[PDB]
Amino acid sequence: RAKIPEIKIASRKIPNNAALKFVKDMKIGWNLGNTFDAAFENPSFDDELLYETAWCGVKTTKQMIDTVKKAGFNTIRIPVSWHNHVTGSNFTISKRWLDRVQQVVDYAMKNKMYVIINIHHDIMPGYYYPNSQHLQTSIKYVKSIWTQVATRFKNYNDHLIFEAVNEPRLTGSRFEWWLDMNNPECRDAVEAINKLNQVFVDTVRSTGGNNVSRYLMVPGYAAAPEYVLIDEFKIPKDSSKYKNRIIISVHAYRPYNFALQAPNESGSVSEWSVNSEESRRDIDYFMDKLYDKFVSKGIPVVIGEFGARDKNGNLQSRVEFAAYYVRAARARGITCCWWDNNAFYGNGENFGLLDRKTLKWVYPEIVSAMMKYAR
């Protein structure tokens, strides 16, 4: 038991173009997290398809996706980590692995849903790594994965979306999550991502079919709002006839201390209230900035990941949060996607909404709270 607040946020001026209507139509998204995104080295098993269930514990079925669709989500993001499923010098994706993803994509297409696929946890020297020392290999990798991926889904309609990569950053470095634009290693990465996103777009468009007119999502550094807001960030060019088809990809588990920060750290909070200037602040802050630079100039933005972890049964707070977040975004013309990883209890990051093994919504209160301000 938890009550859904009434959110009074002034609806803002949203330009009337194909892109923003497209994004509006996505309504709201649902991430199939801890699933195909799972990545780790030296598996001790022989079936690579077990990567699908290593972090969620259950194989995906069409009835799940059905359940997600009836609940009101019109988008499903299917994050993919590919690096554990390639061989050879030009990164050949396993047929079994690519087949299995397609099966799950067809689950959603059959549900007339919007679908997002990407490169996820492949951020790593030798695969995707945004700096000059590894650009040489990264371009080949972005090129190879996407030629393969875009070619198989060549004939799928515009309801299918390609997201270049999830949270590209300098892993292992002291700037992994934060940038010093005064530090040259940082400036190099931002430039490197601009390059890799452009390779991404060129590659997809070159494979023909409906990939020439498909909506593509691209992130800034670390998928942070900040690093698409900086001047250095470049929206990739398309010499094609299909205009305004690049969407800004951002992630924001904000306010951090409530949404994402672990409960055993001292600056965590379990409370969130719409009546608190403090709880609303960071949401207003970053969303205003994305709207000023992008949406308001006709350029589409999508929040691909967001959510709030369960902290010992703080349902009411998560409800007011979800409702406020989705409204604040919709009022600014932005569609969001919850990160649902089928995790509900324990000291892990419990972002679960749908018990996948029973098909019952553990927190329908949170879902309804989102559906209320999502159209």
Side-chain angles (χ1 to χ4, degrees):
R1 235 333 176 211
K3 165 179 174 345
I4 297 178
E6 296 283 352
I7 308 284
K8 160 214 185 150
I9 302 181
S11 186
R12 312 208 172 152
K13 163 80 182 139
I14 312 307
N16 198 282
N17 55 28
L20 294 174
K21 180 150 340 119
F22 181 86
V23 167
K24 189 173 173 301
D25 209 71
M26 287 172 82
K27 187 189 177 185
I28 190 187
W30 183 87
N31 280 270
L32 187 67
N34 280 1
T35 314
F36 294 111
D37 36 313
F40 46 82
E41 328 299 328
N42 308 121
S44 58
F45 45 84
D46 180 343
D47 194 355
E48 70 181 317
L49 280 206
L50 281 159
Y51 266 97
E52 178 187 358
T53 60
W55 293 1
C56 61
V58 67
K59 183 177 187 179
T60 318
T61 70
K62 187 180 172 317
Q63 304 58 7
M64 273 180 238
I65 297 338
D66 285 328
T67 304
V68 173
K69 176 55 177 102
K70 159 160 212 297
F73 296 102
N74 204 35
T75 305
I76 168 175
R77 186 175 178 235
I78 305 174
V80 190
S81 297
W82 311 94
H83 79 266
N84 300 124
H85 313 290
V86 293
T87 47
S89 31
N90 209 0
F91 305 107
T92 298
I93 309 178
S94 164
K95 163 156 203 310
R96 275 172 58 73
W97 180 257
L98 188 50
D99 286 340
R100 177 52 186 157
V101 178
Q102 179 170 25
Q103 273 167 31
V104 175
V105 174
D106 292 340
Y107 293 164
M109 291 294 287
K110 265 165 182 75
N111 260 295
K112 289 192 190 321
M113 288 180 81
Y114 288 98
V115 183
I116 298 172
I117 61 178
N118 68 3
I119 297 185
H120 210 76
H121 293 327
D122 293 336
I123 310 302
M124 194 171 310
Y127 300 110
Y128 195 116
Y129 200 86
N131 77 4
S132 250
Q133 177 180 8
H134 308 262
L135 176 55
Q136 199 170 1
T137 296
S138 295
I139 295 179
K140 186 169 145 179
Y141 186 78
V142 170
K143 231 189 256 289
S144 177
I145 290 290
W146 281 113
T147 299
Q148 296 171 67
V149 174
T151 291
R152 198 176 291 201
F153 294 96
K154 178 186 183 182
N155 295 348
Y156 283 61
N157 61 24
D158 55 348
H159 268 74
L160 185 55
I161 305 159
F162 296 165
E163 173 190 298
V165 56
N166 159 82
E167 303 184 1
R169 66 199 184 279
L170 298 173
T171 64
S173 76
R174 71 189 187 243
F175 297 106
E176 176 173 351
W177 295 109
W178 161 90
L179 285 204
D180 179 348
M181 289 294 307
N182 305 300
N183 189 317
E185 182 182 357
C186 291
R187 293 194 71 86
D188 181 54
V190 173
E191 239 5 89
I193 289 175
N194 279 342
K195 189 39 174 170
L196 291 165
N197 285 347
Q198 183 64 71
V199 173
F200 160 73
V201 179
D202 293 348
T203 298
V204 173
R205 299 298 191 224
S206 78
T207 60
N210 309 97
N211 295 335
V212 187
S213 79
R214 183 172 263 103
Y215 283 89
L216 312 179
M217 287 176 63
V218 291
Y221 189 88
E226 283 80 11
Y227 304 131
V228 313
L229 285 166
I230 55 180
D231 310 333
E232 285 80 3
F233 175 80
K234 274 178 224 144
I235 301 177
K237 298 127 147 205
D238 202 345
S239 260
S240 97
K241 164 218 133 132
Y242 300 92
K243 287 296 139 66
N244 200 25
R245 289 236 177 31
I246 308 291
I247 309 181
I248 309 302
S249 172
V250 303
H251 301 177
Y253 296 69
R254 302 177 180 182
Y256 168 80
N257 62 352
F258 169 72
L260 185 49
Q261 190 175 9
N264 57 11
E265 301 184 16
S266 180
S268 170
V269 306
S270 291
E271 303 170 34
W272 193 110
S273 174
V274 319
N275 287 345
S276 176
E277 191 185 8
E278 172 73 31
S279 288
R280 295 174 44 133
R281 190 181 67 234
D282 295 347
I283 302 180
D284 295 337
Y285 186 73
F286 89 80
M287 289 191 182
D288 277 342
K289 297 262 177 28
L290 288 174
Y291 173 75
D292 290 336
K293 184 173 188 196
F294 293 123
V295 184
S296 88
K297 312 276 179 55
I299 284 138
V301 174
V302 159
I303 302 181
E305 289 194 31
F306 92 104
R309 66 191 295 168
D310 169 49
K311 294 185 176 129
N312 304 317
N314 63 339
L315 178 60
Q316 175 65 36
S317 288
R318 291 208 280 174
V319 168
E320 298 187 30
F321 165 84
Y324 183 73
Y325 196 108
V326 171
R327 175 58 198 156
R330 176 58 59 215
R332 281 164 197 100
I334 302 180
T335 302
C336 314
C337 306
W338 183 279
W339 180 261
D340 191 336
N341 61 8
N342 195 42
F344 296 97
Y345 54 76
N347 69 312
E349 297 170 5
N350 308 330
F351 277 101
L353 296 183
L354 174 60
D355 185 351
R356 302 182 188 178
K357 353 189 205 183
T358 72
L359 296 186
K360 281 171 286 198
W361 291 99
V362 181
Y363 310 103
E365 296 90 336
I366 291 180
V367 186
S368 307
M370 290 186 287
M371 298 305 169
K372 183 178 193 181
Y373 297 105
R375 189 196 69 80

